[PDB]
Scaffold this active site. Sequence first.
Site, PDB file in Angstrom:
ATOM      1  N   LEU B  10      -8.715 -15.019 -52.934  1.00 27.01           N
ATOM      2  CA  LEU B  10      -7.541 -15.044 -53.804  1.00 27.01           C
ATOM      3  C   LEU B  10      -6.534 -16.176 -53.651  1.00 27.01           C
ATOM      4  O   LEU B  10      -5.321 -16.011 -53.698  1.00 27.01           O
ATOM      5  CB  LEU B  10      -6.830 -13.711 -53.662  1.00 27.01           C
ATOM      6  CG  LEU B  10      -7.605 -12.511 -54.110  1.00 27.01           C
ATOM      7  CD1 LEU B  10      -6.606 -11.404 -54.150  1.00 27.01           C
ATOM      8  CD2 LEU B  10      -8.251 -12.693 -55.470  1.00 27.01           C
ATOM      9  N   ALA B  11      -7.086 -17.351 -53.494  1.00 27.57           N
ATOM     10  CA  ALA B  11      -6.297 -18.568 -53.464  1.00 27.57           C
ATOM     11  C   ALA B  11      -6.118 -18.914 -54.947  1.00 27.57           C
ATOM     12  O   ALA B  11      -6.755 -18.257 -55.781  1.00 27.57           O
ATOM     13  CB  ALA B  11      -7.097 -19.626 -52.736  1.00 27.57           C
ATOM     14  N   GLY B  14      -9.486 -19.135 -56.831  1.00 33.16           N
ATOM     15  CA  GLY B  14     -10.126 -17.842 -56.985  1.00 33.16           C
ATOM     16  C   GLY B  14      -9.435 -17.040 -58.071  1.00 33.16           C
ATOM     17  O   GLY B  14     -10.101 -16.500 -58.950  1.00 33.16           O
ATOM     18  N   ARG B  33      -9.473 -11.297 -47.697  1.00 28.11           N
ATOM     19  CA  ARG B  33      -9.382 -10.934 -46.293  1.00 28.11           C
ATOM     20  C   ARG B  33      -8.030 -10.277 -46.000  1.00 28.11           C
ATOM     21  O   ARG B  33      -7.992  -9.171 -45.432  1.00 28.11           O
ATOM     22  CB  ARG B  33      -9.592 -12.206 -45.532  1.00 28.11           C
ATOM     23  CG  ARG B  33      -9.314 -12.224 -44.060  1.00 28.11           C
ATOM     24  CD  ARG B  33      -9.452 -13.694 -43.842  1.00 28.11           C
ATOM     25  NE  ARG B  33      -9.097 -14.166 -42.522  1.00 28.11           N
ATOM     26  CZ  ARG B  33      -8.340 -15.232 -42.306  1.00 28.11           C
ATOM     27  NH1 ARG B  33      -7.826 -15.946 -43.300  1.00 28.11           N
ATOM     28  NH2 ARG B  33      -8.151 -15.619 -41.060  1.00 28.11           N
ATOM     29  N   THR B  34      -6.921 -10.937 -46.331  1.00 25.94           N
ATOM     30  CA  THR B  34      -5.641 -10.273 -46.198  1.00 25.94           C
ATOM     31  C   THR B  34      -5.391  -9.610 -47.551  1.00 25.94           C
ATOM     32  O   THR B  34      -4.854 -10.121 -48.535  1.00 25.94           O
ATOM     33  CB  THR B  34      -4.584 -11.313 -45.814  1.00 25.94           C
ATOM     34  OG1 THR B  34      -4.817 -12.537 -46.496  1.00 25.94           O
ATOM     35  CG2 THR B  34      -4.685 -11.607 -44.322  1.00 25.94           C
ATOM     36  N   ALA B  76     -14.066 -22.938 -46.735  1.00 30.43           N
ATOM     37  CA  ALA B  76     -14.866 -22.746 -45.538  1.00 30.43           C
ATOM     38  C   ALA B  76     -16.100 -23.573 -45.228  1.00 30.43           C
ATOM     39  O   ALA B  76     -16.692 -24.242 -46.067  1.00 30.43           O
ATOM     40  CB  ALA B  76     -15.294 -21.272 -45.499  1.00 30.43           C
ATOM     41  N   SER B 128     -15.854 -27.336 -60.045  1.00 33.56           N
ATOM     42  CA  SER B 128     -14.996 -28.497 -60.099  1.00 33.56           C
ATOM     43  C   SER B 128     -14.110 -28.444 -61.328  1.00 33.56           C
ATOM     44  O   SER B 128     -14.497 -27.967 -62.398  1.00 33.56           O
ATOM     45  CB  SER B 128     -15.862 -29.767 -60.120  1.00 33.56           C
ATOM     46  OG  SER B 128     -15.155 -30.991 -60.000  1.00 33.56           O
ATOM     47  N   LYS B 183     -22.811 -31.480 -56.184  1.00 34.63           N
ATOM     48  CA  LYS B 183     -21.365 -31.344 -56.033  1.00 34.63           C
ATOM     49  C   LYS B 183     -20.801 -32.471 -55.160  1.00 34.63           C
ATOM     50  O   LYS B 183     -19.936 -33.226 -55.615  1.00 34.63           O
ATOM     51  CB  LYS B 183     -21.052 -29.961 -55.412  1.00 34.63           C
ATOM     52  CG  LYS B 183     -19.621 -29.676 -54.988  1.00 34.63           C
ATOM     53  CD  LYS B 183     -18.633 -29.944 -56.095  1.00 34.63           C
ATOM     54  CE  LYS B 183     -17.243 -29.790 -55.593  1.00 34.63           C
ATOM     55  NZ  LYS B 183     -16.339 -30.522 -56.496  1.00 34.63           N
ATOM     56  N   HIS B 186     -20.896 -36.005 -56.540  1.00 32.31           N
ATOM     57  CA  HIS B 186     -19.824 -36.024 -57.529  1.00 32.31           C
ATOM     58  C   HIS B 186     -18.506 -36.506 -56.925  1.00 32.31           C
ATOM     59  O   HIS B 186     -17.901 -37.449 -57.446  1.00 32.31           O
ATOM     60  CB  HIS B 186     -19.685 -34.594 -58.137  1.00 32.31           C
ATOM     61  CG  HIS B 186     -18.362 -34.190 -58.719  1.00 32.31           C
ATOM     62  ND1 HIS B 186     -17.788 -34.676 -59.878  1.00 32.31           N
ATOM     63  CD2 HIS B 186     -17.425 -33.381 -58.190  1.00 32.31           C
ATOM     64  CE1 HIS B 186     -16.575 -34.207 -60.039  1.00 32.31           C
ATOM     65  NE2 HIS B 186     -16.345 -33.419 -59.025  1.00 32.31           N
ATOM     66  N   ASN B 187     -18.061 -35.854 -55.855  1.00 33.96           N
ATOM     67  CA  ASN B 187     -16.820 -36.215 -55.172  1.00 33.96           C
ATOM     68  C   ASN B 187     -16.909 -37.638 -54.640  1.00 33.96           C
ATOM     69  O   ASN B 187     -15.910 -38.359 -54.708  1.00 33.96           O
ATOM     70  CB  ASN B 187     -16.533 -35.222 -54.021  1.00 33.96           C
ATOM     71  CG  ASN B 187     -16.171 -33.862 -54.592  1.00 33.96           C
ATOM     72  OD1 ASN B 187     -17.028 -33.272 -55.249  1.00 33.96           O
ATOM     73  ND2 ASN B 187     -14.968 -33.324 -54.447  1.00 33.96           N
ATOM     74  N   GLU B 190     -16.256 -39.798 -57.448  1.00 37.80           N
ATOM     75  CA  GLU B 190     -14.841 -39.662 -57.724  1.00 37.80           C
ATOM     76  C   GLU B 190     -14.031 -40.614 -56.857  1.00 37.80           C
ATOM     77  O   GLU B 190     -13.103 -41.260 -57.359  1.00 37.80           O
ATOM     78  CB  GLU B 190     -14.448 -38.244 -57.457  1.00 37.80           C
ATOM     79  CG  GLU B 190     -13.017 -37.930 -57.744  1.00 37.80           C
ATOM     80  CD  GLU B 190     -12.732 -36.503 -57.363  1.00 37.80           C
ATOM     81  OE1 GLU B 190     -13.079 -35.604 -58.151  1.00 37.80           O
ATOM     82  OE2 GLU B 190     -12.163 -36.280 -56.275  1.00 37.80           O
ATOM     83  N   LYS B 260     -10.802 -35.175 -47.371  1.00 40.33           N
ATOM     84  CA  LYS B 260     -11.331 -33.868 -47.025  1.00 40.33           C
ATOM     85  C   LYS B 260     -12.877 -33.953 -46.973  1.00 40.33           C
ATOM     86  O   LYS B 260     -13.607 -33.237 -47.680  1.00 40.33           O
ATOM     87  CB  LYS B 260     -10.842 -32.861 -48.074  1.00 40.33           C
ATOM     88  CG  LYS B 260     -10.107 -31.641 -47.528  1.00 40.33           C
ATOM     89  CD  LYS B 260      -8.622 -31.536 -47.935  1.00 40.33           C
ATOM     90  CE  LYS B 260      -7.741 -32.640 -47.338  1.00 40.33           C
ATOM     91  NZ  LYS B 260      -7.858 -32.702 -45.851  1.00 40.33           N
ATOM     92  N   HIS B 452     -41.814 -57.271 -33.821  1.00 43.78           N
ATOM     93  CA  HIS B 452     -41.873 -56.198 -34.818  1.00 43.78           C
ATOM     94  C   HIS B 452     -42.928 -56.180 -35.928  1.00 43.78           C
ATOM     95  O   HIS B 452     -43.092 -55.127 -36.547  1.00 43.78           O
ATOM     96  CB  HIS B 452     -40.480 -56.093 -35.437  1.00 43.78           C
ATOM     97  CG  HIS B 452     -39.459 -55.467 -34.533  1.00 43.78           C
ATOM     98  ND1 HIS B 452     -39.426 -54.106 -34.271  1.00 43.78           N
ATOM     99  CD2 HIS B 452     -38.359 -55.991 -33.931  1.00 43.78           C
ATOM    100  CE1 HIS B 452     -38.355 -53.818 -33.546  1.00 43.78           C
ATOM    101  NE2 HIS B 452     -37.700 -54.946 -33.336  1.00 43.78           N
TER     102      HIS B 452
HETATM  103  N1  LIG Z   1     -11.870 -17.295 -41.216  1.00 40.34           N
HETATM  104  C1  LIG Z   1     -11.818 -16.730 -42.418  1.00 40.34           C
HETATM  105  N2  LIG Z   1     -12.559 -15.659 -42.722  1.00 40.34           N
HETATM  106  C2  LIG Z   1     -12.609 -15.226 -43.974  1.00 40.34           C
HETATM  107  N3  LIG Z   1     -11.950 -15.774 -44.995  1.00 40.34           N
HETATM  108  C3  LIG Z   1     -11.182 -16.845 -44.768  1.00 40.34           C
HETATM  109  C4  LIG Z   1     -11.136 -17.303 -43.471  1.00 40.34           C
HETATM  110  N4  LIG Z   1     -10.472 -18.440 -43.377  1.00 40.34           N
HETATM  111  C5  LIG Z   1     -10.075 -18.696 -44.632  1.00 40.34           C
HETATM  112  N5  LIG Z   1     -10.475 -17.731 -45.473  1.00 40.34           N
HETATM  113  C6  LIG Z   1     -10.045 -17.559 -46.885  1.00 40.34           C
HETATM  114  O1  LIG Z   1     -10.233 -18.746 -47.680  1.00 40.34           O
HETATM  115  C7  LIG Z   1      -9.382 -18.594 -48.841  1.00 40.34           C
HETATM  116  C8  LIG Z   1      -8.780 -19.924 -49.292  1.00 40.34           C
HETATM  117  O2  LIG Z   1      -8.324 -20.719 -48.184  1.00 40.34           O
HETATM  118  C9  LIG Z   1      -8.321 -17.563 -48.481  1.00 40.34           C
HETATM  119  O3  LIG Z   1      -8.478 -16.393 -49.292  1.00 40.34           O
HETATM  120  C10 LIG Z   1      -8.572 -17.239 -47.018  1.00 40.34           C
HETATM  121  O4  LIG Z   1      -8.265 -15.870 -46.720  1.00 40.34           O
HETATM  122  P1  LIG Z   1      -6.729 -15.471 -46.420  1.00 40.34           P
HETATM  123  O5  LIG Z   1      -6.214 -15.143 -47.771  1.00 40.34           O
HETATM  124  O6  LIG Z   1      -6.925 -14.304 -45.527  1.00 40.34           O
HETATM  125  O7  LIG Z   1      -6.093 -16.660 -45.787  1.00 40.34           O
END
Ligand SMILES: Nc1ncnc2c1ncn2[C@@H]1O[C@H](CO)[C@@H](O)[C@H]1OP(=O)(O)O
EC number: 1.1.1.44
Lengths: 473, 473
Positions: B10-11, B14, B33-34, B76, B128, B183, B186-187, B190, B260, B452
């Site tokens: 849910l960033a 997402g 996750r949270t 990730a 993308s 993918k 592509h970058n 870019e 990155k 060689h």
């Molecule tokens: N170690 C981890 N395990 C699972 N999800 C993770 C994670 N580290 C980053 N993310 C998730 O990657 C997404 C974009 O950075 C976020 O939803 C984040 O969850 P979060 O919301 O708990 O931070």
Amino acid sequence: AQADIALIGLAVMGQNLILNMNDHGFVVCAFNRTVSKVDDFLANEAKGTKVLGAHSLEEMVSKLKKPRRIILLVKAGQAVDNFIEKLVPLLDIGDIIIDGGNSEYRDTMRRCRDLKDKGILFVGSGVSGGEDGARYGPSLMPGGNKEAWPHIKAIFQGIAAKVGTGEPCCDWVGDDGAGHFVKMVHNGIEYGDMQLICEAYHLMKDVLGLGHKEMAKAFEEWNKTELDSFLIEITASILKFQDADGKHLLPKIRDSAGQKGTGKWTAISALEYGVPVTLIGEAVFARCLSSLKDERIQASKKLKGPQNIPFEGDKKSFLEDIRKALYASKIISYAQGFMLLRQAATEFGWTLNYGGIALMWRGGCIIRSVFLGKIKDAFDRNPGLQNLLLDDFFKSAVENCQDSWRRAISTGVQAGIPMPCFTTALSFYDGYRHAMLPANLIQAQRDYFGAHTYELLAKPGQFIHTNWTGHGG
Amino acid sequence: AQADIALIGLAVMGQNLILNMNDHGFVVCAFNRTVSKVDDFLANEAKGTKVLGAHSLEEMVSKLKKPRRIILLVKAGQAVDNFIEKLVPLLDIGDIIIDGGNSEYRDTMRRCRDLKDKGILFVGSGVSGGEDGARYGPSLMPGGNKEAWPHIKAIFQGIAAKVGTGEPCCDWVGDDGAGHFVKMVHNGIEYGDMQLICEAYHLMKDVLGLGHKEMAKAFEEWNKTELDSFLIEITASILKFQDADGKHLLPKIRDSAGQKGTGKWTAISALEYGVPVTLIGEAVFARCLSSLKDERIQASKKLKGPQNIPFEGDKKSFLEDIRKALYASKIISYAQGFMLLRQAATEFGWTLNYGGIALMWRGGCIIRSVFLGKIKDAFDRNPGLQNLLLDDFFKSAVENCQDSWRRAISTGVQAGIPMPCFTTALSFYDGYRHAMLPANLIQAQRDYFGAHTYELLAKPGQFIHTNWTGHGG
Ligand SMILES: Nc1ncnc2c1ncn2[C@@H]1O[C@H](CO)[C@@H](O)[C@H]1OP(=O)(O)O
Ligand SMILES: Nc1ncnc2c1ncn2[C@@H]1O[C@H](CO)[C@@H](O)[C@H]1OP(=O)(O)O
């Protein structure tokens, strides 16, 4: 206990090195996987020498004085581990294994730790100079466990190549992977230096129309100026060489440059650590390009060049300008070379002596030149020097070579001569020189399309995100 | 069973993607996750939508229709594996996990095999276009287990960006790592495209003396010629933009380009597989160079440039020449880009559709342009095309741009403007064009100093070793 040191690996490099060792009064117990080659050696090249030959690893291990010093000169990746596998059963705590193959720096790091852990001192060293080098004076570049260094010290430095003021081209480089990494930055630079000469050669050949005799003459004059170096020397020889039919052989051989991974690896490390080692990269890529030999024969039929404008100017002046371009560029390649070594020193935490290294490359190895000498006393003059281009000698050598270098590239560009390395060198020089580079537009774009944030020029450290999109709307 | 598909992550990316899916009539069970962020989303951005929100992985797994389709948009490396770890307990044979993070192509390969092994269909796709892209029309690039493709087909292609003649910028790329590799090439491209613009900008700024208004005007005219592309468009915007004090903001921001890792990786793959992708390499290295901001402020005080010769010529003609140089170079970068894709197709054995890919990059993504269109029908015209430079359109576009390109580089070189990518492009063009390159001297040198061997130009295949050393002695 009679053999001072053992060497496993009876290829030409191993034989010539065992032989050089023997000549410096060290008894060597030779060993090899196909144990016949040991017998062959003993009857043949080693007849009448003080060398002993083993027929089993445990025999070889018995012939050794303590601390047992054995050398792996097995052309390898896998094969080295397998020998290490075998040897540790057989070894007491404090025994030494040196690995001379051109290994992967990370494998060496790994191995060193593991053996240190099991009480054995591992050192991996680069060996350079080829077989004739191996025979009479190799550059040696040792790294790994420094406890081993006083124990191998005498051998390594005695068989090392010695520079004019009598110092061996061998000194301990640093921890775990340092030697093997230094070794492979070396081969990277070697790639760079040969591509620069191919370009100098392409410009004399197609722009200047010089035949291979005059061309060889030019390379010989050059080996007598600041470019006194082994590769300039053998190039004059290669250009002169005539075949069985009395015609020059260089026009006869196929232009598809081979590789054995080390140059590739220098370029990859630069990319991983963010070190702008551009000429070496261009060099690896120019060998990749020549491999597409069939494809270029095809492209030549279809892709067109610039309008042919004859060289109208003085040939001697231009031959000068190419001298100066090859040289200013060589400087930039070496400057980038040691920026890599520097960043790895921060990366893996090794205290490398850059003048030490410059000296280890001054004799022995394929890149030997009068040039590594001036590099060495740049770093003697200031061992904390951040970049070679800031040392007054080089700072001035480039400043002098500068519009000859620009004039050589402009003509090459107009004439359609491919010059990857000569142009990256100018591009890096002008890049580095500029205190303000258009990289801020990369940054502005990235904050716009991808929310990446950016710093203001005054106030480094704070990151801002402007909402560009619409400035209202 | 009610949610068509689930998305964990849910960033902004997402959320905007879950939202686009919902709008195309797909019920999405969101998870994160949270787990608070799920609640936040539901009350806020998703209030009134058809979306369901889970509070445990097992709840989320229950809300799904079969075959269970879940998406990982977790920024990730590690975090994706951990989720895969969790999910396989919970999944039936035939369930699908899609990974949308910009993953390492080899990790994806691995994962796909392992899950295929345990009956689960894994697909990794590049996504993308950023967050605004995610919202209304992402490019999507799926690869992995093709069994999954008919099951995710409708969603992926419905939410995909659609090009003028209504096709989605999303089609299955190929096996295991194909999507994730496509993918990251592509970058890479870019990176190339932005550095080329920084160079065009540096030449107008320092050689031509254009102020940012005129400069923006020039970029706008250019977005109306063959260079109609999103990055030319937002560049004109960035140059125009004025800050709170009414002065232009680009002069204000710090020139240290961030990374990155994806562009870095394109260049590293070229090096590993021996594919001459030179502009992207130069681009990654030009971002490395700007990071040494302090070092360049220091070098500028000490390293000197060419004698300042004012631009004496027509400004409008030169603005044309830079247009043509940026364009001929863009062509060479893309031509190299697809040589990489081609070699990986031979390397990992994937049958990629290069026109398919060109189309997936024609809309959605940051590199969208009219240009990818002409690339697509080069490969429609001939899908077995070995290299883009041999397609008549490009073959002629470069032939036309050619002495403008040489004239732009010569002036830049004379004037001291750093142009890494503009010069590599000319160097690769002239390299590829030549059916005989000085790589034979590399080869002659290597047979000399290191035994060689080499092939003769007539009689490829047989390798000779000449004893150069002394031709008698
Ligand atoms: N170690 C981890 N395990 C699972 N999800 C993770 C994670 N580290 C980053 N993310 C998730 O990657 C997404 C974009 O950075 C976020 O939803 C984040 O969850 P979060 O919301 O708990 O931070
Ligand atoms: N797999 C292997 N195990 C051990 N030594 C090997 C090996 N592969 C190559 N070498 C050795 O590397 C050296 C140089 O290539 C040779 O002495 C060769 O042994 P050989 O003589 O048995 O071929």
